[PDB]
Structure formats: C-alpha cells, structure tokens
Design a protein around this ligand. Structure first.
Ligand SMILES: *[B-](O)(O)c1cc(NC(C)=O)cc(C(=O)O)c1
Ligand SMILES: *[B-](O)(O)c1cc(NC(C)=O)cc(C(=O)O)c1
Ligand SMILES: [Cl-]
Ligand SMILES: [Cl-]
Ligand SMILES: [Cl-]
Ligand SMILES: [Cl-]
Ligand SMILES: [Cl-]
Ligand SMILES: [Cl-]
Ligand SMILES: [Cl-]
Ligand SMILES: [Cl-]
Ligand SMILES: [Cl-]
Ligand SMILES: [Cl-]
Ligand SMILES: [Cl-]
Ligand SMILES: [Cl-]
Ligand SMILES: [Cl-]
Ligand SMILES: [Cl-]
Ligand SMILES: [Cl-]
Ligand SMILES: [Cl-]
Ligand SMILES: [Cl-]
Ligand SMILES: [Cl-]
Ligand SMILES: [Cl-]
Ligand SMILES: [Cl-]
Ligand SMILES: [Cl-]
Ligand SMILES: [Cl-]
Ligand SMILES: [Cl-]
Ligand SMILES: [Cl-]
Ligand SMILES: [Cl-]
Ligand code: NA
Ligand code: NA
Ligand code: NA
Lengths: 469, 474
C-alpha cells in the first residue's frame, strides 16, 4: 500500500494540512493519468458524471495501488513553518476575532513548494488557506497586471511619472485610496511604495488603449480571471487567487521573468517502479529580463521604504544578518481591510502570505502594515533557522539588456523643447537615470509626459515645473 | 571607611585614598559635588566667595579628602539589576549601532518620572576602550528633540496654539537669505502640528519660535526651570537645536518633565550621604516644579505618542513589537533628533513611569550613516528597553498617558485649525466651511475663529496660495 514522501524520500504517511494537501494533489495527477490511460475525450472530461467517477477511481487507485508519491516538501522547513504559526500566529489577532493565515514558500527556479502554512490550527479549523481559499490579491496585483506589463511593453520606465491627481470612475464616484481622493504627479517608485490607486488605474487603461494582450501575460502565470473589462482590475477588483497561485506570480518576477508552474508533487511511481507521473519543467519567459529586473529594483524599495509594511524593521530586530538578504516585495490591503497580503522574495525563494477572516469581515487597520509583517518576519526567521542558507545571499541585478536613460525628475522624460499654451519652453532641471525595457529608452518630454492626467491637471503640473527654472 | 551603594544598600565600591567603572566615577563625582556644597555652607562661604577659583579648588580638594578619610555611607539611586542589565545590553547589542562610519559611541539615561532618580545608564560602548562618559559628560546638540520643549510645548502652554493648529512649511529664508532646509527639502505647504512633529519639519518650528519672541514669551524661564543652560536665545535655529549643547542626563530630565504631566524633578544619582556619627550631610529633597501646565504636557504626550507610532522618523515601535509585543503595547511616547550633518542621533522615550534618553554619534563629531538614528539607534534602544524589562518586568508600567481634565476641546476646521466662520478672502467675504476635527488647547477658551492668517507663519504669497486651495474645496 501507497506512500507520500518528503523530497528526501522520508515517508510522510501511508494512505495534517500536509497530508490532505499532498494527497489531493496526488489524486489530481492520478486523475489526469487515468483519463489519459482510458483515452477519455475532452468532451467526456467536461461531463460531471465522468469527473465524479474518475475522481473516485483516482482515489481508490492510490489506496489500493502501491505508489510512491514524491512531494517537493522539505521536512525541516515545513515543520519549522508549522512551529512558526503555532508559536507566533497569535501576533495576528487584533481584536477582530481569530485571524486566519496562509503562506507558501516556493523555490524561484523550479516552482517547487518547499513548505506552507495552511491556517492557525488544522485541529480547530480545516480550511486550507494556502491552497484552497481564493481572495482578492488587492494591490499586489499592480506590479504584475499594470506596471510590469507597461514596462515590458515599452510604455513606461523606472522613473516615469504617473498622475495621482483626483479622478473618477465612469459612474462618477471618486477613485479613492485610504481616505484620500489623490494628490498630483508622482514617479512609479512613489506610486509603488505608497500603493496609490489612480496611477494603477491609468496604467491599465493605457494598456487597453494600446491593445495590449494582458490576459496573455496573466494566463502564462496560471491566473484565471473571468472578466478583464473592469476599471479596478489592476487594484485587485474582479480577481480571486489562492496563496499558492499568487506566490507563483511573484516567483515569475523574482526568477528574472521566467515562470515555473507551482507544484507539490514531483513524481508518482507504480509499485514496479514505472513512473506514472513526473513533473516536466516548462520555463516560460512571461516578462523580459529587463522588465523583471527593473521591477525587482522597485519592489526592493517597496520594502526599504517601509511605507505600507514594517517588515524590514521587524526582520532587522529578530535577525540582522537575514535582514541583509536582498529582499523585495509588495503589500496588499483590500478596500475594507478584509484581506492583507505580503509577498516576499529573495533571488532564491518566494514567500507569499495572506491573512483575513473566513467569513470575510474587516481586520484592524494595521493588520497588514504591522501584524502580518511581524508574523512573516518571525516565519522568515524560522525558515532560516531550519535551513540556514536556503534564502541565499545573492543580489537581484539589472539585466544587461536594460536600457538606461537621462530623464528629468519632473517629467520622467529627456529634457527638450515643449509648448505650454503658446509660449514654447526649453525644459531643463535635475535628472535621474531611468530604466526601460525597450529598444530606445525614454522619449523626449511631451506636454502629456505622464501616465494619466486631465488638461486641468496638466496646466497645474506645468505651472509648478515652469515656475521651477 | 566610605562606601557607595546601590539603592537597596548593596555596596558598589569603597572610597579610600589613592596611591601616588563608569558607575564608580559618576556616583563618586556627584557625591563630591554634594559634600562640596555641604562643607561650603557649614563654613558659611557665600556665592561671593564661592565665585573665587582658589576657593572652589580648596573646597573640591576638601570634599575629596572628606569622603576618602571620613566614614560616609553614600546611597545612590542606581538600581543594580537594571543597570547591570543595561551594561549587558550595550555589550550584547552595541554592534547594532556600527554602521560603517566606525565605532559608534552611545549614551543612555533611565530616569524615574516621579522623582528624577536615575535608575541606570550606558556611558559608552566599552569603558575599557574609551572612558568618555557619554551619559553624564558629553554635550551635543539635541537637534529636533529640542522642538517639543522649546517651541511647541511653550506655544501650547502660552495659549498660542493647540493640538491641531496649522503651521506653515512653505519655503522661507533665514535673515541672511539662506533657505531653511529639512533634509533636502526646501519646504512644502501648510501642515498640522501633528504632521510637523511626525516628520520633524523645521520651518514650522522656526515660525513657532519667532511667534514666541514676538509675544515676548519668557522662553529662558521655562528651559531654566528644567536645568537647561543655553547661553544665547537670540538665534533663529534655536528651536531646531542650533546653539544648544546638552548631556544625555540633562536632556532626559527635559522629557521627564513632559512625561510627568508638566512637573519637573531635578535629576540625581545620589539620594543620601550619611556620616558614621549619624550626621546626614546630604539627603535629596523632593522639590517638584510645574514647568508646563498639566493641560500642555498631556496634550504634548498625545502628539509624542504618534511621533513613535507613525514610524516616520524612527522604526522603534516596529523593532520593539518584534522583540516584546506586550512591552510594545505599553504607552510609549517619544521624539527623535538628527543634526544637520548626521553627527548626532537622539531618541527620547517615555512611559508614564520612566524616561529613557538615548544619544549616538562619534567623539570626534564626524558623520554617521544616514539611517543611523532612524534605524540603528531605534533598533538598539528597543533591545535596551527590552533588556530593562527582563530585569525588572514591572518597571516600565502599564499606565496610560491621558488628557488632563483641564484640557479645553474645540471643534475646528481641519483646513485652518480654527473654528468655522466667515473670512475676508481678498475683498470678498467667505463662508469657511468643511470637515472638522477636535483640537486640544491649554487655555481658557480654546481655538479662535478662523482668520485670514489662520496658520503659524506664512507669507502673503503663501496665504493666497493656501486659500486658493481651501476656497476650492467648498
Ligand atoms: B492596495 O494598497 O491593496 C489597495 C487596493 C485597492 N483596490 C480596490 C479594488 O479597492 C484599494 C485600496 C484602498 O483604497 O485602500 C488599496
Ligand atoms: B531634526 O529633524 O533633528 C533636524 C534639525 C536640524 N537642525 C538644525 C539646527 O539644522 C536640521 C535638520 C535637517 O536639516 O535635516 C533636521
Ligand atoms: Cl526533506
Ligand atoms: Cl517614496
Ligand atoms: Cl486582455
Ligand atoms: Cl487564478
Ligand atoms: Cl476584455
Ligand atoms: Cl502538484
Ligand atoms: Cl506495481
Ligand atoms: Cl533596509
Ligand atoms: Cl517600520
Ligand atoms: Cl543604456
Ligand atoms: Cl538618454
Ligand atoms: Cl523602443
Ligand atoms: Cl481637464
Ligand atoms: Cl565616568
Ligand atoms: Cl538596587
Ligand atoms: Cl503625519
Ligand atoms: Cl527668553
Ligand atoms: Cl544644559
Ligand atoms: Cl534674547
Ligand atoms: Cl563620624
Ligand atoms: Cl496645571
Ligand atoms: Cl472642553
Ligand atoms: Cl467648540
Ligand atoms: Cl483663554
Ligand atoms: Cl509675500
Ligand atoms: Na497595501
Ligand atoms: Na560591529
Ligand atoms: Na529627527
């Protein structure tokens, strides 16, 4: 009778979060294997009755067969993660009841899942918040769906300027962030650190205007998103993901643009040793190396800046060496504080983390900012203790293909002549290196130098700019 | 022969004559200052004679001899378990300060808010390597930790602003024509007190101090009640710490005053000297002074609570949270400091029971790294605050700072920090309206009606520009 092992061949069980997660995945691979073995047509496989039967026939196969199921799970690491959430999960409770939690640690280079947190305590609550739970990824959407795609397309670079000026949705309601209706122009860096919404709204809207196949990108990463025609899409509206699937997105950015499909099972072998399933590596360059490495740079500072997450502070206090790893990441917070995300990467690993309530009520305001950040610092340390060089010491680095431009700070763009209602101006001032992922680098400065902005906005910004020579 | 004891009576050391450790020198030195004052007054020397240098030297010599040969018991306020714990903390965690500019030195004073007793201190990285006492001897500019005491606290006390009053942070020059800078920023716009505190902007502080001069406020009087020695008050950048130099111990005494509801207790490390024959030659006398009203102090507490919790200029609450979440939930308030070339970092922390002063920098005054104060010092002091807890788990207390009853509350416009009402904007009189906030004052009657110059500071151009904005939003 059959076995599931850790990656080193150590038996997990013969046929708790660990048990069911790995088994359910093994059964899903067994389901595929049998449907292909019986030549079940794709029409047939859509049939509900057929699915039940084959779901049931895969389950019995594992029980009765004598298969070895090799998982990707690292015993020391996964176990250290269980202790972590046991020891430190209480840091999440903030007076809104018992806060649940999902984490997935993924190898950036393989997609393998080394260990995971399923929830506060399987014995109290059996919902798997790492693999099953689907929640809006909120602002963690932005680097993937908006900004990363805009850069990859050549429509934006590291120090391009976006409008966070007040603006409304089609219905007339103001696009909000926290309680702000917006401010003014702003670099991509600042838009990312503070997690503004308006800048993301204009970015997505620009992608639609340029006809960019955004679905194409998201699908290459395994994202199932049913409707792309949504103005708040890039802020995580109309999207729902597992922590495992979402971790896979950040795995893509971290792995210099190259997707590896997540997996928890690497091999199933019949009792006579014939492989019935084995994981096939299909790297996929979702973003250009320039794009991914440019994005790595920005997400480095999302964490450094500490604007929306205290994480680096927390990690520094618990483990100052570890804190010097080249961490990058992105927070998410849903509009009523229903869900907090913190996504973290070093060159080697990605660790995704969600918290919230099962019934979807609000957390405290600081639940993502402080609590989750603190918790994940403890979790990241606990993985370190268990496997001391697993995080690695590599730095993320700009790909040589990255083009570097001299732009004005004020416009995001090369200095140049511009007309400001009549009066042409020679536009001059302090400059910055901007990183682009196109052939040619930044354009020269135009009147509409920014992503988004009304006319009014533009004669307000140009006002100050002109003032400032 | 003579002995210096911890506060429970344990012996720290014997004083006998020499042939021809911070704790020894610090406690002995203050004991000799006491013996000095005693011997002088026993002999009826007057401030006339005691101004004469041959006479000081005589009475300093006499006080040394007296403790060396006499049979005095000297009782210090030092708490042995806590002080030890602090020596351990700097030993274990001092390296957290080293940022690549060399060996960063450090001074700390833990003070009891209710008496001014010093319970323990850190004198430097390692007395062996360097004997400069950075807790008691080194004087440095308190930088922006000047602002609550010299500027905003006094303004509130004098009824010239309240908790949500607006201040100008629009660009402006010193009298010589140079811009008042903060980091690289030439300024922004109008600003609540709270925001001005959390970011530690300079211009609001500049204007605040200017106001107090225009109003002839006795700022020296306040600072002196707290033991501060500032030689020259006519200095534009005073409130930012310009032309001020202080020990960690003196400066801890200033934050003690705000923390103890406005009431100052003079710092001391010695509570009693007693002779063998029963003669008490010195015993510390409790002499509370109300420097700020309880209203002012408790309002200030609320603002300093958020300086820490906003995490703008320090990571401390984050650091402490990860080290000791329960302790991070005590009622911490504080203020940071950074001199203009990054030479000096300060963090001043209080709970209702204790104040902990912290300075870091280099004995030769060269620059620290840019984040030394924001991050390094904040992290170290969270380690230090925690180590103090471990040694004495109730010492910090679970009490909360709270507004005194005497605090006046007012409904004001968020835009103007003043009560809603009509204003004359450039000819046409306007119905100044919008969302409100509760603002705390330490006067009789609270906020005024909004006037054209609602803010502390600002030029005509500035006020135009800001009203421009406010009129828009109606
Ligand atoms: B983000 O910082 O997680 C974020 C995302 C949104 N998106 C949507 C669709 O509401 C809103 C907000 C916010 O207004 O706080 C933040
Ligand atoms: B403060 O945030 O510690 C502060 C204080 C000063 N003071 C003086 C006298 O220059 C300057 C600055 C600064 O230029 O950043 C900050
Ligand atoms: Cl293993
Ligand atoms: Cl920023
Ligand atoms: Cl699409
Ligand atoms: Cl999905
Ligand atoms: Cl569509
Ligand atoms: Cl799998
Ligand atoms: Cl077999
Ligand atoms: Cl950092
Ligand atoms: Cl922080
Ligand atoms: Cl280039
Ligand atoms: Cl260029
Ligand atoms: Cl191009
Ligand atoms: Cl317009
Ligand atoms: Cl000394
Ligand atoms: Cl003691
Ligand atoms: Cl603020
Ligand atoms: Cl004065
Ligand atoms: Cl002084
Ligand atoms: Cl004067
Ligand atoms: Cl005697
Ligand atoms: Cl009073
Ligand atoms: Cl009242
Ligand atoms: Cl009122
Ligand atoms: Cl009054
Ligand atoms: Cl003017
Ligand atoms: Na966020
Ligand atoms: Na060191
Ligand atoms: Na400061």
């Amino acid at each position: 009778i059959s076995e599931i092992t850790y990656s080193d061949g150590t038996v997990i069980a013969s046929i708790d979060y660990l048990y069911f997660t790995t088994l359910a995945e093994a059964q899903e691979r067994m389901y595929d294997y049998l449907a292909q073995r019986d030549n079940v047509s794709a029409k047939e496989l859509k049939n509900e009755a057929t699915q039940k039967f084959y779901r049931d026939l895969a389950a019995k196969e594992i029980e009765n067969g004598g298969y070895k199921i090799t998982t990707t799970i690292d015993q020391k690491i996964h176990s250290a993660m269980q202790s972590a959430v046991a020891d430190y999960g209480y840091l999440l409770d903030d007076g809104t009841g018992r806060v649940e939690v999902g984490n997935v640690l993924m190898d950036n280079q393989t997609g393998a899942i080394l260990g995971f947190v399923g929830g506060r305590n399987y014995q109290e609550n059996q919902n798997n918040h790492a693999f099953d739970t689907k929640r809006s990824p909120a602002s963690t959407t932005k680097p993937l769906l908006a900004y990363g795609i805009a850069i990859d397309q050549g429509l934006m670079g590291s120090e391009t300027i976006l409008s966070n000026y007040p603006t409304n949705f089609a219905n007339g309601n103001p696009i909000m962030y926290a309680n702000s209706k917006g401010t003014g122009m702003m670099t991509l860096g600042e838009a990312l650190n503070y997690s503004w919404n308006i800048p993301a709204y204009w970015t997505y809207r620009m992608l639609r205007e340029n006809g960019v196949d955004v679905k194409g990108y998201m699908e290459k990463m395994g994202y199932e998103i049913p409707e792309y025609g949504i103005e708040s899409l890039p802020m995580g509206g109309g999207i729902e993901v597992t922590v495992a699937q979402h971790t896979n997105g950040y795995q893509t950015l971290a792995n210099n643009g190259v997707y590896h499909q997540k997996h928890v099972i690497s091999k199933i072998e019949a009792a006579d040793g014939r492989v019935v399933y084995e994981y096939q590596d299909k790297p996929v360059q979702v973003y250009s190396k320039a794009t991914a490495t440019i994005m790595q740079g920005l997400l480095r500072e999302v964490l450094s800046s500490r604007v929306t997450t205290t994480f680096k502070s927390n990690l520094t206090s618990l483990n100052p060496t570890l804190a010097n790893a080249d961490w990058i990441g992105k927070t998410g917070t849903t509009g009523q504080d229903e869900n907090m995300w913190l996504m973290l990467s070093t060159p080697r690993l990605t660790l995704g983390g969600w918290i919230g309530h099962d019934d979807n009520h609000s957390l405290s305001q600081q639940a993502g900012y402080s609590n989750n950040s603190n918790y994940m610092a403890h979790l990241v340390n606990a993985i370190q203790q268990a496997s001391p060089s697993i995080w690695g010491n590599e730095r993320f680095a700009l790909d040589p293909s990255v083009v570097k431009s001299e732009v004005l700070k004020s416009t995001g763009q090369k200095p140049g002549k511009v007309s400001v209602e009549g009066k042409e101006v020679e536009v001059t001032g302090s400059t910055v290196t901007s990183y682009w992922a196109n052939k040619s680098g930044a354009p020269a400065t135009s009147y509409r130098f920014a992503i988004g902005g009304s006319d009014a906005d533009y004669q307000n910004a140009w006002s100050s700019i002109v003032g400032s020579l």
